[PDB]
Structure 1
């Protein structure tokens, strides 16, 4: 009832892990190096906007 209601197995609001989980290994000034997770999250984000603009 308090800690794991079955409805929470289904995701509606996705937590975004902060940079220390997905460190941007930023070498030089004119370059960066985003973590795999940072790309996959941008993929989630991209797919989501696609859906939200499509349904609206």
Structure 2
């Protein structure tokens, strides 16, 4: 469908970053993080995305 689902859109160019309510920081006590798995995984994406960008 030309308005909501063109084929070109199955190939990711710009990844949406979900907000914290989706990947909550389970912040036990004061000085201790406790970040979600999705936060770690998005970090790994960023980490890899920077290496590729600089590399090229």
Class of the TM-score when normalised by the shorter of the 2 chains: over 0.9
Q: Deviations over 1:4-36 (max 9, x none)?
A: 000000000000000000000011121010000
CA RMSD of aligned residues (A): 0.5
Structure 2 residue runs without a partner (length 5+): none
Count of residue correspondences: 55
**What is the Cα deviation at residue 49 of structure 1?**
0.2
1:19 aligns with 2:20: yes
**TM-score when normalising by structure 2:** 0.95
Structure 1 residue runs without a partner (length 5+): none
d(CA) in 2 for partners of 1:4, 1:37: 26
